Design a protein around this motif. Structure first.
Motif, PDB file in Angstrom:
ATOM      1  N   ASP A 192      40.733  40.275  35.591  1.00  0.00           N
ATOM      2  CA  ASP A 192      41.239  41.479  36.273  1.00  0.00           C
ATOM      3  C   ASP A 192      41.888  41.088  37.605  1.00  0.00           C
ATOM      4  O   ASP A 192      41.686  39.967  38.131  1.00  0.00           O
ATOM      5  N   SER A 193      42.613  42.054  38.180  1.00  0.00           N
ATOM      6  CA  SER A 193      42.962  42.057  39.590  1.00  0.00           C
ATOM      7  C   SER A 193      41.737  42.454  40.425  1.00  0.00           C
ATOM      8  O   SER A 193      40.750  42.979  39.894  1.00  0.00           O
ATOM      9  N   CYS A 194      41.794  42.144  41.723  1.00  0.00           N
ATOM     10  CA  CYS A 194      40.701  42.450  42.671  1.00  0.00           C
ATOM     11  C   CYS A 194      41.287  42.640  44.078  1.00  0.00           C
ATOM     12  O   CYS A 194      42.500  42.578  44.278  1.00  0.00           O
ATOM     13  N   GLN A 195      40.408  42.936  45.044  1.00  0.00           N
ATOM     14  CA  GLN A 195      40.763  43.055  46.436  1.00  0.00           C
ATOM     15  C   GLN A 195      41.643  41.875  46.860  1.00  0.00           C
ATOM     16  O   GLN A 195      41.307  40.732  46.587  1.00  0.00           O
ATOM     17  N   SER A 198      46.288  43.764  45.685  1.00  0.00           N
ATOM     18  CA  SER A 198      47.035  45.029  45.848  1.00  0.00           C
ATOM     19  C   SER A 198      48.505  44.743  46.162  1.00  0.00           C
ATOM     20  O   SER A 198      48.818  43.801  46.903  1.00  0.00           O
ATOM     21  N   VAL A 216      49.767  46.616  41.493  1.00  0.00           N
ATOM     22  CA  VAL A 216      48.333  46.638  41.663  1.00  0.00           C
ATOM     23  C   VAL A 216      47.974  47.684  42.720  1.00  0.00           C
ATOM     24  O   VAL A 216      48.435  47.585  43.864  1.00  0.00           O
ATOM     25  N   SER A 217      47.083  48.624  42.349  1.00  0.00           N
ATOM     26  CA  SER A 217      46.790  49.793  43.188  1.00  0.00           C
ATOM     27  C   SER A 217      45.284  49.920  43.489  1.00  0.00           C
ATOM     28  O   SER A 217      44.903  49.844  44.656  1.00  0.00           O
ATOM     29  N   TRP A 218      44.453  50.125  42.465  1.00  0.00           N
ATOM     30  CA  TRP A 218      43.010  50.358  42.686  1.00  0.00           C
ATOM     31  C   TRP A 218      42.179  50.071  41.437  1.00  0.00           C
ATOM     32  O   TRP A 218      42.707  49.872  40.360  1.00  0.00           O
ATOM     33  N   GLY A 219      40.852  50.092  41.633  1.00  0.00           N
ATOM     34  CA  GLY A 219      39.892  50.032  40.554  1.00  0.00           C
ATOM     35  C   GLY A 219      38.468  50.241  41.058  1.00  0.00           C
ATOM     36  O   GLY A 219      38.204  50.076  42.222  1.00  0.00           O
ATOM     37  N   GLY A 221      35.262  48.388  41.486  1.00  0.00           N
ATOM     38  CA  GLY A 221      34.963  46.989  41.356  1.00  0.00           C
ATOM     39  C   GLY A 221      36.073  46.262  40.612  1.00  0.00           C
ATOM     40  O   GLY A 221      37.206  46.765  40.516  1.00  0.00           O
ATOM     41  N   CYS A 222      35.731  45.092  40.073  1.00  0.00           N
ATOM     42  CA  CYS A 222      36.708  44.181  39.454  1.00  0.00           C
ATOM     43  C   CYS A 222      36.083  43.569  38.197  1.00  0.00           C
ATOM     44  O   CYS A 222      34.917  43.158  38.214  1.00  0.00           O
ATOM     45  N   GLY A 229      41.642  48.057  35.622  1.00  0.00           N
ATOM     46  CA  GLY A 229      42.537  48.041  36.763  1.00  0.00           C
ATOM     47  C   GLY A 229      43.505  49.201  36.643  1.00  0.00           C
ATOM     48  O   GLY A 229      43.892  49.546  35.522  1.00  0.00           O
TER      49      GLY A 229
HETATM   50  N1  LIG Z   1      39.666  46.420  39.413  1.00  0.00           N
HETATM   51  C1  LIG Z   1      40.878  46.291  39.961  1.00  0.00           C
HETATM   52  N2  LIG Z   1      41.924  45.946  39.208  1.00  0.00           N
HETATM   53  C2  LIG Z   1      41.042  46.391  41.353  1.00  0.00           C
HETATM   54  C3  LIG Z   1      42.300  46.392  41.975  1.00  0.00           C
HETATM   55  C4  LIG Z   1      42.422  46.463  43.364  1.00  0.00           C
HETATM   56  C5  LIG Z   1      41.260  46.545  44.150  1.00  0.00           C
HETATM   57  C6  LIG Z   1      41.326  46.610  45.533  1.00  0.00           C
HETATM   58  C7  LIG Z   1      40.143  46.687  46.286  1.00  0.00           C
HETATM   59  O1  LIG Z   1      40.181  46.761  47.651  1.00  0.00           O
HETATM   60  C8  LIG Z   1      38.908  46.720  45.653  1.00  0.00           C
HETATM   61  C9  LIG Z   1      38.831  46.635  44.269  1.00  0.00           C
HETATM   62  C10 LIG Z   1      40.008  46.544  43.533  1.00  0.00           C
HETATM   63  C11 LIG Z   1      39.915  46.474  42.157  1.00  0.00           C
END
Ligand SMILES: N=C(N)c1ccc2cc(O)ccc2c1
Length: 247
Positions: A192-195, A198, A216-219, A221-222, A229
């Motif tokens: 996945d994408s994560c913090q 974005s 990439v916008s939000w989710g 957790g990851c 995502g």
């Molecule tokens: N699960 C995702 N793809 C995803 C994408 C962006 C994220 C931005 C954050 O600050 C925190 C979690 C996030 C999770």
């Protein structure tokens, strides 16, 4: 990027690395973005909303590493930071999470395409791949949700598009996700994408052309079971991009 693989800028040459100058002179990474024409980078509004002053930002193209120079990189100031007037954030979901950066070098020039710097095509209006399609995501974000540090080397992975219908489910995101968002995930939820990812690109091959399908916008957790995502659905924002990318 959780899971996936390390990469270099040659494999995602539209990828833009966006940093912020601090009051004190230190420079820190903010978010990814994508070069959509010589003078324009597209990213997410939530990356900038707290610090909207364009003078605070630096954009790198041709960069494969986070805190070191890559041979052949180009550095830009932000001549125009355009945030979406209709952006909003709820507890989780971001709406209209899209931003444009007009870049100009200290020599007053736009991007010069090279082996390490190229544009990415926008989709045509409302033209997205079918659900189940494999797309790629790129960025410098965390490798594990519990990490403090961001990776020094660029990363990328593959996720599959999820239907709006499947994403609407209660134990997915319920009504949090809209038709202007795209969900994507790994069938094993292993990558996945994560913090820190974005603003960066979700790229799919459409009618045989590499296409910026998502940002990439939000989710929640990851790489979490039942929590895809969530990406800005670029093919639903073309009027906004058109109206903002001229004189
Ligand atoms: N699960 C995702 N793809 C995803 C994408 C962006 C994220 C931005 C954050 O600050 C925190 C979690 C996030 C999770």
């Amino acid at each position: 990027i959780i899971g996936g693989e390390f990469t270099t800028i040659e494999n995602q040459p539209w990828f833009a690395a966006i940093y912020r100058r601090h009051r004190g002179g230190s420079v820190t990474y903010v978010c990814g973005g994508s070069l959509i024409s010589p003078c324009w980078v597209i990213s997410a509004t939530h990356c900038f909303i707290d610090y909207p002053k364009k003078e605070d930002y630096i954009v790198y193209l041709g960069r494969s590493r986070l805190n070191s120079n890559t041979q052949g990189e180009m550095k830009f100031e932000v001549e125009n930071l355009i945030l979406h007037k209709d952006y909003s954030a709820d507890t989780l979901a971001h709406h209209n999470d899209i931003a444009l950066l007009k870049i100009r070098s200290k020599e007053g020039r736009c991007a010069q395409p090279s082996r390490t710097i190229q544009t990415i095509a926008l989709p045509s209006m409302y033209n997205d791949p079918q659900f189940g399609t494999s797309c790629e995501i790129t960025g410098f974000g965390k490798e594990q949700s519990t990490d403090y540090l961001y990776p020094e080397q660029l990363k990328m992975t593959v996720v599959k598009l999820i239907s709006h219908r499947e994403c609407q489910q209660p134990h997915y995101y319920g009504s949090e996700v809209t038709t202007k968002m795209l969900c994507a995930a790994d069938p094993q939820w292993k990558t996945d994408s994560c913090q820190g990812d974005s603003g960066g690109p979700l790229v799919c091959s459409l009618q045989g052309r590499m296409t910026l399908t998502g940002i990439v916008s939000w989710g929640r957790g990851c790489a979490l079971k039942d929590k895809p995502g969530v990406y800005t659905r670029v093919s639903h924002f073309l009027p906004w991009i058109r109206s903002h990318t001229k004189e």
